[PDB]
Amino acid sequence: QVLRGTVTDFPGFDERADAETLRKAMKGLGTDEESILTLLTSRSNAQRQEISAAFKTLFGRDLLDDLKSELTGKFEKLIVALMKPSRLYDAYELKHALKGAGTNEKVLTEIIASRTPEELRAIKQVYEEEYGSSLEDDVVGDTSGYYQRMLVVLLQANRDPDAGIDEAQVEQDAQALFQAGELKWGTDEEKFITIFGTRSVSHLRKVFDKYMTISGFQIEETIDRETSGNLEQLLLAVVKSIRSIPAYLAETLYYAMKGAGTDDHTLIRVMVSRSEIDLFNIRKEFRKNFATSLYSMIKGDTSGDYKKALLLLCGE
Ligand SMILES: [Ca+2]
Ligand SMILES: [Ca+2]
Ligand SMILES: [Ca+2]
Ligand SMILES: [Ca+2]
Ligand SMILES: [Ca+2]
Numbered sequence: 356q357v358l359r360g361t362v363t364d365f366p367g368f369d370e371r372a373d374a375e376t377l378r379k380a381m382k383g384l385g386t387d388e389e390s391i392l393t394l395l396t397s398r399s400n401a402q403r404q405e406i407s408a409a410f411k412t413l414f415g416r417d418l419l420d421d422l423k424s425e426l427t428g429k430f431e432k433l434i435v436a437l438m439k440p441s442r443l444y445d446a447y448e449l450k451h452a453l454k455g456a457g458t459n460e461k462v463l464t465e466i467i468a469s470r471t472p473e474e475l476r477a478i479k480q481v482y483e484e485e486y487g488s489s490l491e492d493d494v495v496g497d498t499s500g501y502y503q504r505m506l507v508v509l510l511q512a513n514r515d516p517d518a519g520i521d522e523a524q525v526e527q528d529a530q531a532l533f534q535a536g537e538l539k540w541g542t543d544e545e546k547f548i549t550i551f552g553t554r555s556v557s558h559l560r561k562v563f564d565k566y567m568t569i570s571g572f573q574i575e576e577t578i579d580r581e582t583s584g585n586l587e588q589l590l591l592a593v594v595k596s597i598r599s600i601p602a603y604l605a606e607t608l609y610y611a612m613k614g615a616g617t618d619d620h621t622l623i624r625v626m627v628s629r630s631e632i633d634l635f636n637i638r639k640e641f642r643k644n645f646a647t648s649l650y651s652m653i654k655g656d657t658s659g660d661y662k663k664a665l666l667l668l669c670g671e
Contacts, residue, residue, distance in 0.1 A: 356636070358632055358633040358635075358636055359633065359635040359636060360629065360630050360631040360632050360633060360634050360635060361630055361631075361634040361635050361638070361668060361669060361670040362396070362397075362399055362400075362630045362631050362634075362668065363399060363631070364398075364399045364401065364402060365397050365398045365399065365402055368398065368402050368405075370402070370405040370406045370408070370409035371409050371413065373394060373398065373402075373406045373409070374406055374409040374410040374412075374413050374414075374418075375413070376390060376394055377390075377391060377394060377406065377410065377418065378410065378413075378414060378416075380394075381421050381422070381425050386425045386426070388426065388430065388660045389660070389663075391422070391426075391434065392430075392434075392660055392663055392664045392667070393667065395434060395437055395438075395664075396437070396664055396667040396668050397667070399631060400437070400440060400441045400630075400631060401441075403437065403438055404440055406418065407419065407438070418438070419435065419438050422434050422435065422438070423435065428661065429619050429623070429657075429661045430659065430660045430661040430664065432619070432620075432623055433623050433627070433661060433664055433665070434664070436623055436624070436627045437627055439627075441631065442477065442481055443481060443485065444627070444628055445466050445470065445474070445478050445628060446478050446481045446482040446485060446486075446490075447485075448462055448466060448624055448628070449462065449463065449466055449478070449482065449490065450482065450485075450486055450493070453493045453494065453496075453497045458497045458498065460498075460502075460585050460588070461588075461621070462624070463494065463498070463506065464506075464585070464588050464589045464592050465592060465607060465621075466478075467506055467509050467510065468509065468589060468592035468593045468595075468596050468603075469592065469596045469600050469603055469604060471600075472512035472513070472514055473512075475509070475510065475512040476512050478490065479491070479510070479512075490510065491507060491510050494506050494507065494510065495507060498585075500585075500586065501544045501545075501548060501586045502585040502586045502589060504548060505548045505551070505552060505586060505589050505590075506589065508548055508549070508552035508553065509552050509593070513553060514552070514553055514554065514555060514556065515553060515554055515555040515558065516555060517555045517556060517557040517558070518555070520557060520558060520561060522561075524558070525558065525561045525562055525565060526565060528550050528554065528558075528559075528562045529562050529565035529566045529569060530569070531543075531546060531547065531550065532547060532550060532562060532566050532574065533566055533569050533570055535547045536566075536570070536574065536577040537577075539577070540577075540578070540584075540586065540587060540590060544586070547590075550562070551590060551593050551594075551597075552593075556597055559597045560597060560598070563594070563597070563598070574594055575591060575594055575595070578590060578591050580610075599640065600633065601633050601636035601637040601639070601640045602640040602644065604625050604629060604633075604637050605637045605638075605640035605641040605644060605645075605649075606641075606644065607621060607625055608621070608622060608625050608626075608637070608641065608649065609641065609644075609645055609652070611625075612652055612653070612656040617656055617657065619657070619661075622653075622657070622665070625637075626665055626668050626669070627668070630668055634668070634669070634670075635670075637649070638650075638669065638670075649669055650666060650669045650670075650671065653665045653666060653669060654666060
């Protein structure tokens, strides 16, 4: 399918002109957040990096340090995130879910399950450069059990490529998965980890069909998203990503705003990271699955300059 983002290079871009607009906006008493916000959400990530350089050439000041001393709250978290160069974002997000006591298993599952092999290679590469330690050793050092192993398997970015679809292997995997599901994924974990983690995307889709034409239940129906289980949360995220990455991220966003509070960190992470990849496709899945639009949900769930920036990122 064709992936379309909501943010694209801004025509007639001038990094010096933009460097100055931002300077006048930060300069002196009071800040013009309305100006920063509108400027930053209509320039691609590559352009924001160019604005930063020109800002440094013209004033000898660091644009980001400035935005941080001037901005505050979720609006700042959102601006700081947009500034992060595209290639460094998932790696940064991953270093901070692992870093320190505990682990944000949520981010680890979300990024590793929804990212393609090419994306994971580049992430593994950029991560070691930036942080010195390899992603795989930090994951292995923070996670455990079959959760760790499944994450490590996916981290190898070695899913079979899509080619000849043997129906003998398909039915064999469907049966296996069926029986592992009936056992609530608590037995023979080794066998299913290999199927979910190394089988080609087109293969696993036939497996998901067959599996249901064996049980009458979609494979996800054998797992409760709401409840615990790191390994199950991962199996759920993988299944959904194998079906549709936008749909999976379309839902991750939904559950970020659905409830008593708002998971602004997820809301910010998915909005920013996918803005130039498939945020558009994500918007289309959100509407068709949740009967409402992302725009309209973000508008009612967030407030202020923060809300305005998300809405401009969202687009229509
Ligand atoms: Ca100021
Ligand atoms: Ca003000
Ligand atoms: Ca501040
Ligand atoms: Ca830790
Ligand atoms: Ca809410």
